[PDB]
Amino acid sequence: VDYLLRLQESISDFYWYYSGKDVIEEQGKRNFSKAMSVAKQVFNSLTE
Amino acid sequence: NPCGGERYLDFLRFAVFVNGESVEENANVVVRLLIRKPECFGPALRGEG
Amino acid sequence: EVQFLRTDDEVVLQCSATVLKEQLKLCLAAEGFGNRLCFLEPTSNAQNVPPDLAICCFILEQSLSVRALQEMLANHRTLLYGHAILLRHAHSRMYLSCLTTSRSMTDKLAFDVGLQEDATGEACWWTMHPASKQRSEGEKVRVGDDLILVSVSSERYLHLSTASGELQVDASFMQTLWNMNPICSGCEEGFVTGGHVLRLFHGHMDECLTISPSDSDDQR
Amino acid sequence: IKYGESLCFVQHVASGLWLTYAAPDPKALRLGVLKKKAMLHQEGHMDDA
Amino acid sequence: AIMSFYAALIDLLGRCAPETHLIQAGKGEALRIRAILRSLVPLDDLVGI
């Protein structure tokens, strides 16, 4: 749960970084995707 | 220890300045660290005395 | 459950100082109109001399993460360590801010702390940090927690300056531990709460408790 | 009382004083003193548990 | 040694100072860093040295 909270805060920071920009560039999209895959794994772990 | 302080300051200078221009990330990090440890400024720049 | 501070709550910023081997509690205070500079109002001798709390009360208007604050500047939430808070003076409706002037004669790197008319810029935003390892960044700020306040604009701590003979408050590079003691959180509609200005009418007879007019022979 | 989980404040029964850490003495950090003297105080601190 | 330490510190801070193009663009971080550096080092001291 603690790691999930840290990851959630990092993802919120990333969203705030990209909030003003009209479109997310490819590098930001790839980083978002990596973070989302990790979060998916963590959610599956908690579910199990 | 001004002598050792000068060596460490020289390393930080080479870390923050590259090819005649300031590296903003390193410069900001270094400034924040220096102010968080004010003793790095020497006794002269001490706030109180 | 442990009580948590939330936005729109009324608080007082309290610090402690050892004077003549006695622990004295002082609240951050400011008048706003006619004097923007902040000072310290002692509150330990309240049993003998009541303090002037009306100018000590502050309201937590907003609480944002640093990135959210940056976005907002470019363009009831629980407080969390590491967030930046906006404090509005209850009386004057001004905002606690780190001023660019400095009247300190001891510290050459310190800045004056006072009130600012508007909430524009970063001078009126302060970041909360834990005072001990008991709490960490991202944790909710609990009532009675000791915390450190760092100016967003100046990167300085809200500091209690005892260098001179008098106890002063300023923004310096030396940290001071502050307590955000709660004054009020939320009042039920139509009910009376302490610290409110009101009138005391005689039943419903349109007669109110008062003192003699100004410049009266009874000295009011 | 449980090992690890329970947080307990130590109180001297006769006096009622609370077990706490002494106010960090100056120059201890410079001397490298990572140890804080323990004392019995009337009020203590919030992290005394 | 003292003069060299302070000269190196001033050099490091001047190199940490932001770039003119960033200042013209008005970046908040650049303005804040420059304000911090100006508060640290007075202009009169530089002129006197």
Short mmCIF file of C-alpha atoms in Angstrom, two decimals:
data_model
loop_
_atom_site.label_atom_id
_atom_site.label_comp_id
_atom_site.label_asym_id
_atom_site.label_seq_id
_atom_site.Cartn_x
_atom_site.Cartn_y
_atom_site.Cartn_z
CA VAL A 1 0.00 0.00 0.00
CA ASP A 2 2.86 2.39 0.80
CA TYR A 3 4.48 1.79 -2.58
CA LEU A 4 1.11 2.28 -4.27
CA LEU A 5 0.71 5.61 -2.47
CA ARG A 6 4.17 6.73 -3.60
CA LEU A 7 3.39 5.74 -7.19
CA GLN A 8 0.02 7.51 -7.06
CA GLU A 9 1.66 10.71 -5.86
CA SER A 10 4.24 10.49 -8.64
CA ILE A 11 1.49 9.97 -11.23
CA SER A 12 -0.44 12.96 -9.86
CA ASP A 13 2.72 15.06 -10.16
CA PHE A 14 3.12 13.92 -13.76
CA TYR A 15 -0.49 14.82 -14.52
CA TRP A 16 -0.01 18.28 -13.02
CA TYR A 17 3.13 18.69 -15.12
CA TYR A 18 1.20 17.87 -18.29
CA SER A 19 -2.10 19.55 -17.37
CA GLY A 20 -1.35 22.86 -19.09
CA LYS A 21 0.00 21.32 -22.27
CA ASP A 22 -2.52 20.68 -25.03
CA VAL A 23 -1.07 17.29 -26.03
CA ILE A 24 1.26 14.86 -24.26
CA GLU A 25 4.42 14.15 -26.23
CA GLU A 26 5.63 10.65 -27.04
CA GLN A 27 8.19 10.51 -24.21
CA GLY A 28 5.63 11.60 -21.62
CA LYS A 29 3.16 9.09 -23.03
CA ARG A 30 5.71 6.28 -22.71
CA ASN A 31 6.50 7.24 -19.11
CA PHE A 32 2.78 7.37 -18.31
CA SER A 33 2.37 3.92 -19.85
CA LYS A 34 5.22 2.46 -17.79
CA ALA A 35 3.78 3.93 -14.59
CA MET A 36 0.32 2.60 -15.47
CA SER A 37 1.67 -0.91 -16.09
CA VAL A 38 3.40 -0.88 -12.71
CA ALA A 39 0.22 0.39 -11.04
CA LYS A 40 -1.76 -2.36 -12.76
CA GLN A 41 0.59 -4.98 -11.35
CA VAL A 42 0.32 -3.46 -7.86
CA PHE A 43 -3.48 -3.42 -8.02
CA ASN A 44 -3.47 -7.07 -9.08
CA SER A 45 -1.18 -7.87 -6.15
CA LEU A 46 -3.52 -6.20 -3.65
CA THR A 47 -6.50 -7.99 -5.21
CA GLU A 48 -4.74 -11.33 -4.77
CA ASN B 1 38.80 24.67 6.40
CA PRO B 2 38.91 27.15 3.48
CA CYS B 3 41.42 25.00 1.60
CA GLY B 4 39.16 21.96 1.37
CA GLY B 5 36.12 24.17 0.89
CA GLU B 6 37.75 25.61 -2.21
CA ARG B 7 38.31 22.15 -3.71
CA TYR B 8 34.69 21.15 -3.17
CA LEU B 9 33.51 24.48 -4.57
CA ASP B 10 35.66 23.91 -7.66
CA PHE B 11 34.04 20.52 -8.23
CA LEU B 12 30.59 22.08 -7.85
CA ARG B 13 31.59 24.81 -10.31
CA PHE B 14 32.55 22.22 -12.91
CA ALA B 15 29.26 20.43 -12.20
CA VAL B 16 27.04 23.50 -12.65
CA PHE B 17 28.84 25.28 -15.54
CA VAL B 18 29.36 23.54 -18.89
CA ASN B 19 30.71 25.01 -22.14
CA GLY B 20 30.28 28.62 -21.05
CA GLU B 21 26.64 28.17 -20.02
CA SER B 22 24.89 27.30 -16.77
CA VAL B 23 23.18 23.93 -16.40
CA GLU B 24 19.90 25.02 -14.83
CA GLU B 25 19.05 21.74 -13.10
CA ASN B 26 22.42 21.37 -11.39
CA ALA B 27 22.55 25.09 -10.58
CA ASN B 28 19.17 25.04 -8.84
CA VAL B 29 19.97 21.83 -6.95
CA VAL B 30 23.32 23.23 -5.81
CA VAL B 31 21.79 26.52 -4.67
CA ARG B 32 19.08 24.71 -2.71
CA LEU B 33 21.63 22.44 -1.02
CA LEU B 34 23.92 25.36 -0.20
CA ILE B 35 21.12 27.35 1.43
CA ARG B 36 19.89 24.25 3.30
CA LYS B 37 23.43 23.97 4.73
CA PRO B 38 24.37 27.64 5.29
CA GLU B 39 27.72 26.72 6.83
CA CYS B 40 28.96 26.03 3.29
CA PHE B 41 29.03 29.81 2.74
CA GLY B 42 31.81 30.27 5.29
CA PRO B 43 31.67 32.19 8.57
CA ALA B 44 31.55 35.55 6.77
CA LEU B 45 28.18 34.91 5.11
CA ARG B 46 26.68 33.56 8.34
CA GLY B 47 23.30 35.18 8.82
CA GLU B 48 23.52 36.14 12.48
CA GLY B 49 27.15 37.05 13.18
CA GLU C 1 -9.54 8.96 15.12
CA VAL C 2 -6.79 11.57 15.14
CA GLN C 3 -8.17 14.96 14.15
CA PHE C 4 -6.87 16.29 10.83
CA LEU C 5 -6.60 19.88 9.66
CA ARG C 6 -8.63 20.70 6.55
CA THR C 7 -9.03 23.73 4.33
CA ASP C 8 -11.38 26.48 5.58
CA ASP C 9 -10.40 25.65 9.17
CA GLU C 10 -9.34 28.48 11.47
CA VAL C 11 -5.92 28.03 13.08
CA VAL C 12 -3.27 29.90 15.06
CA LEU C 13 0.44 29.46 14.32
CA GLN C 14 2.03 28.80 17.71
CA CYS C 15 5.68 28.56 18.75
CA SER C 16 7.51 28.12 22.05
CA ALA C 17 10.43 30.03 23.55
CA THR C 18 12.47 29.57 26.73
CA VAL C 19 12.57 32.89 28.60
CA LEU C 20 14.03 33.00 32.12
CA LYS C 21 13.84 29.19 32.23
CA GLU C 22 10.08 29.40 31.55
CA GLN C 23 8.32 27.99 28.49
CA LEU C 24 6.34 30.79 26.82
CA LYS C 25 3.87 30.15 23.99
CA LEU C 26 3.53 32.82 21.30
CA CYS C 27 1.02 33.08 18.45
CA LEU C 28 1.71 34.72 15.11
CA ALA C 29 -0.30 37.94 14.95
CA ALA C 30 -0.78 40.90 12.64
CA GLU C 31 -3.12 43.87 12.41
CA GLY C 32 -3.18 44.21 8.62
CA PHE C 33 -4.63 47.72 8.42
CA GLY C 34 -1.97 50.28 9.28
CA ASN C 35 0.75 47.68 9.92
CA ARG C 36 1.39 44.72 7.62
CA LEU C 37 4.29 43.38 9.69
CA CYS C 38 3.72 40.26 11.78
CA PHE C 39 4.64 40.02 15.45
CA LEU C 40 4.26 37.51 18.29
CA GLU C 41 1.46 37.65 20.86
CA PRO C 42 2.21 35.73 24.08
CA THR C 43 -0.57 33.38 25.19
CA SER C 44 0.89 31.60 28.24
CA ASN C 45 -0.35 34.20 30.77
CA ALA C 46 -3.94 34.02 29.50
CA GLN C 47 -5.23 33.38 33.02
CA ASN C 48 -3.90 36.78 34.16
CA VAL C 49 -3.94 38.81 30.92
CA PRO C 50 -6.16 37.68 28.02
CA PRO C 51 -4.38 37.58 24.65
CA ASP C 52 -5.47 39.42 21.51
CA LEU C 53 -6.55 36.38 19.50
CA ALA C 54 -8.76 38.16 16.96
CA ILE C 55 -5.67 39.26 15.03
CA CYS C 56 -4.01 35.86 15.57
CA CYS C 57 -6.72 33.77 13.88
CA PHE C 58 -5.86 32.53 10.37
CA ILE C 59 -7.90 30.57 7.81
CA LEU C 60 -6.46 27.78 5.67
CA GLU C 61 -7.83 28.93 2.32
CA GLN C 62 -6.06 26.46 0.02
CA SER C 63 -3.69 23.48 0.08
CA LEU C 64 -1.98 22.24 -3.09
CA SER C 65 0.93 20.08 -4.12
CA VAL C 66 3.97 21.92 -5.45
CA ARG C 67 3.27 20.98 -9.07
CA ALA C 68 -0.37 22.02 -8.73
CA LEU C 69 0.78 25.36 -7.29
CA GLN C 70 3.18 25.83 -10.20
CA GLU C 71 0.40 25.16 -12.70
CA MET C 72 -1.98 27.53 -10.91
CA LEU C 73 0.66 30.27 -10.84
CA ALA C 74 1.43 29.76 -14.53
CA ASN C 75 -2.26 29.99 -15.42
CA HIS C 76 -12.45 20.77 2.53
CA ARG C 77 -9.21 18.99 1.63
CA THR C 78 -7.06 17.45 4.34
CA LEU C 79 -3.60 18.97 4.62
CA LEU C 80 -0.70 16.69 3.68
CA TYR C 81 2.96 17.20 4.52
CA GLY C 82 4.77 18.68 1.53
CA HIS C 83 1.75 20.62 0.29
CA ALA C 84 1.74 24.41 -0.01
CA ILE C 85 -0.88 26.25 2.04
CA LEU C 86 -2.41 29.70 1.68
CA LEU C 87 -3.25 31.45 4.96
CA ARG C 88 -5.77 34.31 5.01
CA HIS C 89 -5.85 36.68 7.96
CA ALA C 90 -9.31 36.35 9.46
CA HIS C 91 -9.66 40.02 10.43
CA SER C 92 -7.97 41.94 7.62
CA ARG C 93 -8.58 39.24 4.97
CA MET C 94 -4.96 39.65 3.85
CA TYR C 95 -2.59 36.73 3.28
CA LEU C 96 0.43 35.69 5.30
CA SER C 97 3.45 36.20 3.06
CA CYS C 98 7.23 36.50 3.07
CA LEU C 99 8.07 40.12 2.34
CA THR C 100 11.04 41.29 0.29
CA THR C 101 12.02 43.90 2.90
CA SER C 102 14.06 43.20 6.02
CA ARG C 103 14.26 45.35 9.15
CA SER C 104 16.29 42.77 11.09
CA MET C 105 19.52 44.15 12.54
CA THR C 106 20.95 40.74 13.52
CA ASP C 107 20.29 38.42 10.58
CA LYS C 108 21.50 39.76 7.23
CA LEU C 109 19.79 36.98 5.22
CA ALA C 110 16.39 37.11 6.95
CA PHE C 111 13.20 38.56 5.47
CA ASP C 112 10.25 40.22 7.15
CA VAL C 113 7.02 38.23 7.47
CA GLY C 114 3.79 40.15 7.07
CA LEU C 115 0.44 40.37 5.33
CA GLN C 116 -0.17 40.96 1.62
CA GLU C 117 -3.32 42.46 0.13
CA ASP C 118 -3.79 39.86 -2.63
CA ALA C 119 -3.05 36.16 -3.08
CA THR C 120 -1.04 36.66 -6.28
CA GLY C 121 2.49 35.34 -6.68
CA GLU C 122 4.37 32.81 -4.59
CA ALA C 123 5.16 35.11 -1.65
CA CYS C 124 1.90 34.09 0.05
CA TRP C 125 2.43 30.31 -0.24
CA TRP C 126 4.09 28.20 2.46
CA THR C 127 5.05 24.53 2.31
CA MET C 128 4.54 22.30 5.36
CA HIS C 129 7.22 19.79 6.33
CA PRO C 130 7.37 17.29 9.21
CA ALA C 131 9.36 18.27 12.28
CA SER C 132 10.32 14.70 13.25
CA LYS C 133 10.65 11.29 11.64
CA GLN C 134 7.29 10.41 13.22
CA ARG C 135 5.65 11.96 10.14
CA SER C 136 6.75 11.89 6.51
CA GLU C 137 5.88 13.63 3.26
CA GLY C 138 2.42 12.70 2.04
CA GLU C 139 1.08 11.98 5.52
CA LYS C 140 -1.94 13.91 6.76
CA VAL C 141 -1.17 16.80 9.09
CA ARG C 142 -2.68 16.02 12.49
CA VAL C 143 -3.87 18.56 15.03
CA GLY C 144 -1.09 19.20 17.52
CA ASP C 145 1.72 18.22 15.13
CA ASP C 146 4.92 20.25 15.10
CA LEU C 147 5.71 21.33 11.55
CA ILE C 148 8.14 23.53 9.65
CA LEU C 149 6.89 26.18 7.22
CA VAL C 150 9.07 27.09 4.23
CA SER C 151 8.37 30.09 2.03
CA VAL C 152 7.81 29.10 -1.58
CA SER C 153 9.22 32.34 -3.00
CA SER C 154 12.22 32.83 -0.70
CA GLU C 155 13.06 29.23 0.31
CA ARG C 156 13.29 30.43 3.93
CA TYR C 157 11.83 29.04 7.15
CA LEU C 158 9.19 30.80 9.19
CA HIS C 159 11.58 31.52 12.04
CA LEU C 160 11.38 32.77 15.62
CA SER C 161 14.23 35.25 16.06
CA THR C 162 15.46 35.69 19.64
CA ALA C 163 18.79 37.27 18.65
CA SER C 164 17.84 40.70 19.95
CA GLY C 165 16.26 41.25 23.34
CA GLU C 166 12.75 40.94 21.90
CA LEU C 167 11.11 37.88 20.37
CA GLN C 168 10.57 38.43 16.64
CA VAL C 169 9.24 36.44 13.69
CA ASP C 170 10.97 36.48 10.31
CA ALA C 171 11.82 34.35 7.29
CA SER C 172 15.38 33.06 7.76
CA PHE C 173 17.47 29.98 7.01
CA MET C 174 17.19 28.68 10.59
CA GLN C 175 14.14 26.48 11.13
CA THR C 176 11.54 26.90 13.86
CA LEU C 177 8.88 24.40 14.94
CA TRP C 178 5.31 25.69 14.70
CA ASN C 179 1.99 24.30 15.89
CA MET C 180 -1.18 24.95 13.87
CA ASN C 181 -3.62 24.72 16.75
CA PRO C 182 -7.24 24.63 15.50
CA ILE C 183 -9.62 27.42 16.47
CA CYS C 184 -12.72 26.23 14.59
CA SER C 185 -13.55 23.74 11.85
CA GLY C 186 -17.22 24.10 10.97
CA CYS C 187 -20.12 25.70 12.83
CA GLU C 188 -23.66 24.34 12.81
CA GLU C 189 -25.98 26.85 11.18
CA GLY C 190 -27.55 29.27 13.64
CA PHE C 191 -25.46 28.27 16.67
CA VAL C 192 -23.16 30.53 18.66
CA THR C 193 -19.42 29.83 18.82
CA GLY C 194 -16.59 31.42 20.74
CA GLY C 195 -14.54 34.24 19.30
CA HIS C 196 -17.56 35.76 17.53
CA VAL C 197 -18.56 39.41 17.67
CA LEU C 198 -22.23 39.80 18.57
CA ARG C 199 -24.75 41.92 20.46
CA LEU C 200 -26.47 41.04 23.74
CA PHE C 201 -30.08 42.19 23.61
CA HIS C 202 -32.31 42.33 26.69
CA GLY C 203 -34.59 39.42 25.88
CA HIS C 204 -36.41 40.71 22.79
CA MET C 205 -36.98 44.27 24.03
CA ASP C 206 -34.63 45.97 21.52
CA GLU C 207 -32.29 46.94 24.38
CA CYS C 208 -28.64 45.94 24.02
CA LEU C 209 -25.73 45.82 26.44
CA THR C 210 -23.30 48.65 25.75
CA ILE C 211 -20.99 51.25 27.23
CA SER C 212 -21.36 55.02 27.26
CA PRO C 213 -20.69 56.97 24.05
CA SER C 214 -17.22 58.23 23.21
CA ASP C 215 -16.03 61.20 25.27
CA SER C 216 -18.28 60.48 28.26
CA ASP C 217 -17.71 61.53 31.86
CA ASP C 218 -17.71 57.92 33.12
CA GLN C 219 -14.57 57.16 31.06
CA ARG C 220 -16.56 54.48 29.21
CA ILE D 1 0.31 -4.39 25.26
CA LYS D 2 1.68 -5.86 22.02
CA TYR D 3 5.24 -6.17 20.76
CA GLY D 4 5.98 -3.77 17.93
CA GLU D 5 2.46 -2.44 17.46
CA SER D 6 1.56 -0.84 20.78
CA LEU D 7 2.95 2.65 21.33
CA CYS D 8 3.51 3.32 25.04
CA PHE D 9 4.46 6.40 27.04
CA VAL D 10 6.73 5.71 30.00
CA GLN D 11 5.65 7.59 33.12
CA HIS D 12 7.41 7.76 36.47
CA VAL D 13 4.66 6.72 38.88
CA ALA D 14 5.72 8.72 41.94
CA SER D 15 6.24 12.04 40.16
CA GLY D 16 4.15 11.60 37.02
CA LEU D 17 6.99 12.87 34.84
CA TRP D 18 7.14 11.54 31.28
CA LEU D 19 10.18 9.84 29.77
CA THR D 20 11.46 12.04 26.95
CA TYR D 21 14.62 13.21 25.22
CA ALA D 22 16.57 16.19 26.50
CA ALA D 23 16.59 19.34 24.39
CA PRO D 24 19.35 18.90 21.76
CA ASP D 25 22.37 20.54 23.35
CA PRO D 26 24.38 22.86 21.07
CA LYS D 27 27.54 21.64 19.30
CA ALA D 28 26.48 17.99 19.81
CA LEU D 29 25.84 17.74 16.07
CA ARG D 30 29.32 19.13 15.44
CA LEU D 31 30.87 16.70 17.92
CA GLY D 32 29.03 13.94 16.05
CA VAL D 33 26.83 13.00 19.02
CA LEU D 34 24.00 11.02 17.42
CA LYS D 35 22.76 10.06 20.91
CA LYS D 36 20.22 12.19 22.76
CA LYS D 37 20.22 12.19 26.56
CA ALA D 38 16.95 10.95 28.03
CA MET D 39 15.21 12.86 30.81
CA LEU D 40 11.98 12.95 32.80
CA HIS D 41 9.92 16.04 31.98
CA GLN D 42 6.52 17.28 33.11
CA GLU D 43 5.14 17.68 29.57
CA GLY D 44 7.50 15.82 27.25
CA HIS D 45 6.94 15.78 23.50
CA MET D 46 4.38 14.24 21.15
CA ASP D 47 6.85 11.62 19.84
CA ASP D 48 7.65 10.28 23.32
CA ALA D 49 5.84 6.98 22.74
CA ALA E 1 43.20 30.50 1.63
CA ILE E 2 40.28 32.54 2.99
CA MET E 3 40.31 34.87 -0.01
CA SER E 4 40.48 31.91 -2.39
CA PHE E 5 37.60 30.13 -0.67
CA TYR E 6 35.37 33.19 -0.90
CA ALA E 7 36.38 33.84 -4.51
CA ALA E 8 35.54 30.24 -5.40
CA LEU E 9 32.19 30.49 -3.61
CA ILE E 10 31.31 33.68 -5.47
CA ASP E 11 32.39 32.08 -8.75
CA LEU E 12 30.18 29.05 -8.08
CA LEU E 13 27.17 31.23 -7.24
CA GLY E 14 27.70 33.43 -10.30
CA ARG E 15 27.85 30.32 -12.46
CA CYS E 16 24.67 29.01 -10.82
CA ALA E 17 23.02 32.31 -11.75
CA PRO E 18 20.34 31.81 -14.45
CA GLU E 19 20.81 32.64 -18.11
CA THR E 20 19.65 35.89 -19.69
CA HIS E 21 17.30 34.18 -22.14
CA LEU E 22 15.55 32.41 -19.26
CA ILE E 23 15.32 35.69 -17.36
CA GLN E 24 13.77 37.43 -20.38
CA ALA E 25 11.32 34.54 -20.79
CA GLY E 26 10.48 35.25 -17.15
CA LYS E 27 10.71 31.70 -15.80
CA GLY E 28 9.65 31.68 -12.17
CA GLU E 29 12.46 29.33 -11.15
CA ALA E 30 15.07 31.54 -12.81
CA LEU E 31 13.70 34.68 -11.17
CA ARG E 32 13.57 32.98 -7.77
CA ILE E 33 17.15 31.69 -8.05
CA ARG E 34 18.43 35.12 -9.09
CA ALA E 35 16.58 36.71 -6.16
CA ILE E 36 18.14 34.19 -3.76
CA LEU E 37 21.63 34.89 -5.13
CA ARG E 38 21.12 38.65 -4.89
CA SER E 39 19.94 38.30 -1.29
CA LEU E 40 23.01 36.20 -0.51
CA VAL E 41 25.59 38.56 -2.04
CA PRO E 42 25.09 42.35 -1.84
CA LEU E 43 26.18 44.47 -4.78
CA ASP E 44 28.06 46.92 -2.56
CA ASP E 45 30.27 44.12 -1.24
CA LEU E 46 31.15 43.07 -4.78
CA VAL E 47 31.99 46.65 -5.74
CA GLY E 48 34.10 47.10 -2.61
CA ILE E 49 36.08 43.93 -3.22
#
